[PDB]
Amino acid sequence: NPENYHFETLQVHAGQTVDETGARAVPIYQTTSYVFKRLTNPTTDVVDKRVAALEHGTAGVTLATGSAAITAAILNIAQQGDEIVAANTLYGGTYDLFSVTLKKLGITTHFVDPDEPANFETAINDHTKALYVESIGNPGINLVDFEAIGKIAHDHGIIFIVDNTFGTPYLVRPLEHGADVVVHSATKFIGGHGTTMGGVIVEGGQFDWRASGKYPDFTTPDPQYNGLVFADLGGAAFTTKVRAETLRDTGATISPFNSFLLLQGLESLSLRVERHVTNTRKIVAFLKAHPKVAWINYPELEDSPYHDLATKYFPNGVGSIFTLGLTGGEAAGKALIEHLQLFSLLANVADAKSLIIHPASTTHAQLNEQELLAAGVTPDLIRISVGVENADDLIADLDQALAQV
Amino acid sequence: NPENYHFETLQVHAGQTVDETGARAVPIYQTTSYVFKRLTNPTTDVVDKRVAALEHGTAGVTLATGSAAITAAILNIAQQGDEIVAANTLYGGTYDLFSVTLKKLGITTHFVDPDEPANFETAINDHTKALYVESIGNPGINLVDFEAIGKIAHDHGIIFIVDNTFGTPYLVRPLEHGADVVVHSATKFIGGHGTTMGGVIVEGGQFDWRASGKYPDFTTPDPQYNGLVFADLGGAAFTTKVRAETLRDTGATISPFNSFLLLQGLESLSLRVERHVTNTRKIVAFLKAHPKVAWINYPELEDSPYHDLATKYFPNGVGSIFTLGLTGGEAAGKALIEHLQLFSLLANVADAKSLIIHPASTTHAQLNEQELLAAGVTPDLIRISVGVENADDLIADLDQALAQV
Amino acid sequence: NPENYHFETLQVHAGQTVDETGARAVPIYQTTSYVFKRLTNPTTDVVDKRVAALEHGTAGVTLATGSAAITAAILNIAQQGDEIVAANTLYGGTYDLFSVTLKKLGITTHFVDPDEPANFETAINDHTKALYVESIGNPGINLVDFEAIGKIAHDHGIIFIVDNTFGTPYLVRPLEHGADVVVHSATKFIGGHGTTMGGVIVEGGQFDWRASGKYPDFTTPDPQYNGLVFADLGGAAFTTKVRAETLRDTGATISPFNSFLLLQGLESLSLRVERHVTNTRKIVAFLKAHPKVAWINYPELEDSPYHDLATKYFPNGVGSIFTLGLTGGEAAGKALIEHLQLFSLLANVADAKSLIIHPASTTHAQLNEQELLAAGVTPDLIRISVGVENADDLIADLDQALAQV
Amino acid sequence: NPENYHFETLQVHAGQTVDETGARAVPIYQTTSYVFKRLTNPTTDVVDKRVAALEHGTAGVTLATGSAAITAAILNIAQQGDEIVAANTLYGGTYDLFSVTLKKLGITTHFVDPDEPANFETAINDHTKALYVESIGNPGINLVDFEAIGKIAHDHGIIFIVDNTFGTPYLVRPLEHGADVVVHSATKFIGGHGTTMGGVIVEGGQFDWRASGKYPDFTTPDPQYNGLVFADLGGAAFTTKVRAETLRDTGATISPFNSFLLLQGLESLSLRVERHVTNTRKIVAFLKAHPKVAWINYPELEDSPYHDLATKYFPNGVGSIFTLGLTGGEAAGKALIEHLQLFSLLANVADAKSLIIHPASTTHAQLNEQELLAAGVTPDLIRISVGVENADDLIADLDQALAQV
C-alpha cells in the first residue's frame, strides 16, 4: 500500500490496473492459455492482491473454495508424519478435513480447548507444523487471543494460521495480531450475495523460515524449480509455494467468472459488513430483552465470556452470525423457524439475505443429545446469520414469530 | 409490497421467488426459448419487479440500456405527428435522441427552461403526448418541481415521464410526486460498479387512460393481441404495451447475464448510495472552503438556486454528481485533471470508483466557447462523480492536485 | 482476409488478436467505460469483424437481437416519408416491425410476391430507400433470385438488404450476389445452442452513395460529427452510421457476455451447419417417401419450384428448417407432436436440439382459416427445425410417432 | 440411456431436463445454497450425467480441473501406505502429482513401460490400489492395450483408471474395454475452445468391491454417513464417495458458469472431434511426405508400432495431437515455429485453434539433453495440436514455414 490508502479505497482499487484498451472494469479472462511472447489469470490476480491488501498482508492466492484454500495452506507446510494443533471448536467442514481426509494422508491434528492459549503449547511436539484457529468460532461464536497464540507458535518456530471467514478484514486483520497466514471462504462475506464460491490464502511476510529450521522445503534449493529457494521470495514465499506445488498438482483453481464476482463484492465489502453488524447489534438487543429468549451467544455482549477479547480485537463489531436458545427449548426453536417470513431456512451464512437454522431438526437431525453436544450443538440451539435487509423489518418478523411459540 | 417492507428489505428480496430446486440465488436463464407446456425471462423478471417495487410503482420492464428504455417509453405513447415537451437541460444522449432520431420519425420535441413549470404548459398543444424531465440535470445539476409539472401534465390529460437515473429510488421516488412513468439507466447506480448496461421503465398505475382520451391505442381493443385493451391491465398497462409492441418489434432486450449483475447491485443499492452521498457532502464541504474553487453546483448548498427543491424532494441528499469551477478557469481545470492520482479521467458517472472530467479539454475539446455554452458547458466547468472510496483519500487527492494549479 | 483464408479458418480466427497478457481466448470486457487516455467493446468488436469476414463483407456492427439489427438497418436509411419494398413472405416478427412499429413512424413498406423479381421493380417510387428479403423465407421456405433483385435495386440507385439468418454465411453469401447489407439474428445458427441473443449488420462496401443521390445523409458533412461525411468511410460507411446514430441514440447494445458466447458458436459454425444440413437431407428423404406425409417444402428437392435457385445459390444445401403436412391434416399434425420423444415443442429454430411446432394449434391457434393462409399457414402445416442429434435417432422418433397418427 | 440413443443425441440431450419455467437451455445456477424444503448443483449435474452417458458409464462427478479430477480419483481409493502402478508415459502434470504431492502423503507410485502389459503385473503388490494409464500418451502419442491391462487389474482385485482426455468418449470408451473409472480434463476437447477449465470422473459400475476385499472403506458402514455402505450404491459408489469425502473436504468444485460452458462444448463435441481428426489425418499425410520431416509419431501411420491398437480400439481415429522432428533438428524446429502464421505458440492442447510447441527451446529450455530424455523429449521434438481451421490453410502455413527452415 505505497499510497497509504484507507480500507474503503483499497477494496475498490487495490490490485487493479488499466490495460491497453482503457477498460475501467477488470476484464473476465475466461481463458485456459496464453501465447508465449503467464502462469496466473489476470482477473484472479486482482482478487489475490486486493484481499491481501485488505488483510495488510504481502501476497495472496485464490482457489475454488474455502475448503480448497485451507487444504492448500496445510499441505503447503505439512506432509506425512507432520502434525497440526487446532482449536477444537472448528467449523464442521474443517474438522472433517482435518480428522478424515488429512489424517488418512499421515497428518495428525490435535484439537484443543482454545479458551486457554496454553492448551496449544501443551500439544506441540517436534512434529507440529502450525497452529490453526478461526477468528470467530462456529457454532460457538467464540473468540481467541490471537496475540497469545501467535506468541506460542513463534516461540516454537512454527506458523500461526487463522481462518478469518466470519470476521472479514474489515472487522479484524489477524496478520497484525500474530498470525502468519490468513485463509478465507470468499464464498461468504467477500462475495456477499450467496452466488459465488471462492477461497483465498494471504501471507503476512514476517515469518523467518530460516531461523525456524522446521520448514526445510522453504530453505533448500528445489531442483524441481531450478534450485529456487522459496524463502528468498520474502513476502511471497508461502503463496508462491502453494501456486507452484499444491495448486499446480491438485488444481482447485477458481473460475475467472467467480473471481469477477468476488471483485464486485469486494468493492462494497465494508459497506455491507457495516450494515450486517449494525443490523445484528439491533437484532441482538431486541432478542436479549425478549422474555422467550433463554440465552444468546454474541461476544460483544457485556456479560459474554469473550467480551474482553471483543473489545481488544474487534473495534468495529463481532460480525453478523450468532446463536440463541428459546425458553421453550427444541420445540420452540423449531416453531420459530416455521413462522418466520423473511429469514430463509438453510445451512449457509453471510448472504445479503438473512438466514436461520435449527441444526437439531435439520443438518444434525440424525444425532442424539450427546452426539449433538460433541458437535457444539444443543437441542435448543438456533443459529442466525443477519443480512442487510431493513433491521425493523427483521425485528418485526422475529417479534411476530416469537408470539407463535 | 403487501407486507409493507422498507426499502432495504425490498432491494434484497422484492420480485424474487424460490424455484423447485430451492436455489437461494436467482438462476441465470441464459436461454432464448421455452418448451410449450412463458413470455418473459425469469432472471430479468426479478429486475422488473424489484426496481418497480423500489420506485413504489406497479410494474416494470427492463431493456438493454437507459437509452433503449427512454426510446421505448416515448414510442409507447408517441408516433408520427405527436409531440413531447422536455426540459432544455437534458443529458446529451437523450437530447440527441429527441432532436435527431425521434425527429426523423415525425416526433417533435419542444425544449423549455425547466426552472419555471409554466414553460411546460406554454408548449403544450393538441399533439402533446408527454412531459419529460430528469430528476437531477447533467451537467447543470439542476432540480425541477415534480408536483407542479405533474399537475400541468394531468390538467391536460397527458402523462409525466421522469428519468430518475441520477437520483435512484432511494433519494427520490418521482411516482409519488406527480410522475406516471420513471425510466432508469440501470447502467449507473443500480449496477453500481461500471460493468453492466441496462435500462428500466417503471409505471405508477394512477393514470386514467380512458378519462384522458388522448391515448386511443391504450383504450381500443387490438386484433393483434386478440381484443386486448392495454388499459384493462391497470397498473401494468404501460409496461405491458412496451413489452407487447416496441420491445417485441425493435428488440432492445437485456442479457440475462446483465440482469443477474443488476440484481447483485440492487441488493446493496441503498448501502452504496448512502456512502456516495456522505462522501459527496464531505468533498463538497472541502471544496466550498478551498481558496482555488470559484463556484460549485450542488443543490444541497444553502445558497444554491435549487436548495428549496432539495429540501422538498431530496430528504436523503441529492446524489454524488456535481460540478465546479476553479479560480484559474479553463487552464486550472485542465491542469487539475493531470495531477489527480485516485480519480479516474473518463466521461461516465455513478461507478464505485470516483470519476472526473473537464469537458472543454476532452469530450468537448473541439468546441469554441459559444458551442460549449450551447452544450451546457463553460471553459472552466469540471464534473465530478464521487465513488465509495474513503473520503479522506479522495479529499487528499484533490488537495494535492489543487496545490499544483 | 488478405492472406486468403478459407471459411473455417476465419470462423476460428478472424477479428481476434492477442492482447498484452497473451490470453489466447478473447476476454469478456464487461465494462461500461474506458479511461479517457470508447463506444466499441473489444469483445463485441471481434464479433463485428468475424461475421463481416464470413459474409465476405467490409464491416460489421452487433446489436442486442436480430430484431434490433433489422430495425437499425432500416432506420439507418429510412425516415418519415420514406418507403421500403419487402417480400411478403417475411418472418412474422419482421412483418410486425415493418407493418406496425415503423409504419407508425412514417416509413411505408410495400409487400410484394418475391417469386417474381419484377414485383419489386413495380413498387419502387421516388421514396423507396431499400429492397428487403430473407435468404430463406419462413414459413414458406422459399428462395429468391438475389442477383435479379439486386440488379433492380441498383438500377434505381437504392440498396438491397438480405436477412441471411436461415442461410448463415456458410450456405450463401448474399453480398456476393447483389446485396449491399446482410443482417443476422445471431440468436439462431451463429449462437447455435438456443442460449444467447444477438443481431449483426454486415455491409459489402460496393454501393456508391454519391452516385446514387438518394442518400444525402451519407454525403453531406454533419456538424454534430465535425463535418464527417459517412460516404468517405468507404466499406465502413453504413455500419459506422448505425453506430454513430441509431445505435448511439436508441441503445440496442449487446452484452459483452453474449458477444463472447457468439464467438464460441462462430468457432464451430460450419461444423454444426454441415451436420444440420446432412441431418435434414436424411430426414426430408425419409419423410418425403413416407405414406403419411402429404407434402414437404424443402427447396433442394428436385420437384420444388425453387430447385433452380437452390442449385444456383445454395451449393452446400438449403439449411435445416422446413415445413410439411400430413395426410391426416390438422388432427394428424397435432397427434404427431404428442407422440414425439426427441423433438422439442416450441416456436424457435436453429437450436442444436431438434424442434417442431404445429402453428395452427399454438402460436396461431386463435386464427380462422382465412386468418392463417394470410400468414402463410395452413391447418395442416408443421414446421421442423433439425438439430445435430444422430439422424437415425431422429428418424426413429419420427417413425414411431407417425405410426400412431 | 434407457431408449438406446446414439452418441450425437446423447451429447445434445443426456442429463438435461426441462424445469418448471420450460427453459430449453440449462440455467446457470450461480448459487451457493438451496432453501431446505444436497448442494449438488443443477447446472453441473447435467455435465455429470452427460459425460457419464457419453462414456457409457453409470455415474459421473465434475471438479474444477482435470488435475483435481485425477487427484480425487486417486485419493478416493488410496491413502497413506497405499500404492499405484502407472504408465511412465504420463502427462507431465500428472507425473508431478504422483511423484511430488501424493508421494509426500504416503502414496507411492511405480512407473512402468506400458508397451508391455506384463510390466503392470510386475509392480503389483498388496499395497496396490489401482492401475493408471492415459488413452493416448503424451508426448509419445503411444497407445495401450486396455483389455490386457484391465484383465491384470481385475485378476488382482484392483481397479483400472484411464485418463481419456486425449481420446474423448467419441474416439474410445475405456469403460467398455476393461477400465472401471475414466477421468477427463474437460479443459481440453470437451470445452473445445480454450476458455474453461474442468475435470470429470466417470465410473463404469462393473467392479465388485465386496469380492475384491482391498477396498474396506467401500464395504464398511460409515458412521460419518449414518452407516452408509458405499458399495451398496451400485454404479454410483465411486463417484458418490468422491462427492461425499474428497470433494466435500478439499473443495475443488467447478463454477456453475464453467459447467454451462462445458455443456455448450458437449453439444458440438463429436462434430469438432471428427474435424480435428480429419484435419490431423490430412496434415500428417502431408508432413510424412515432406522432405524436411525426419520422423512423425502418430499411431494410425502404417509403420507405427501402435497401428494395431489404433485399429482395435480407435475405429474413428486417434485424435489431433502428434509429434514430429525435422531434418534440421532443434534449430529447424525452433525456426518452424517462428515462421508459422496460423499455429499459436503455447503449451496447451485441444483448442479450436491449432497450437504448436518446441519444448527444448521453451518449457524445458533449462534442461540438458539427458534431463530432456527423462521426460520423453528430444531436442528436435515438436508437438502439434491440430484445430478445426481449414486443413488446406494449415497445410499451406506449414509448407511456407518449412520452406524457410
Ligand code: PRO
Ligand atoms: O454491490 C455488490 O455487492 C454486488 C456484488 C456483485 C455485483 N455487485
Ligand code: PRO
Ligand atoms: O458450439 C460450440 O462449440 C460452442 C461452445 C460454447 C458455446 N458454443
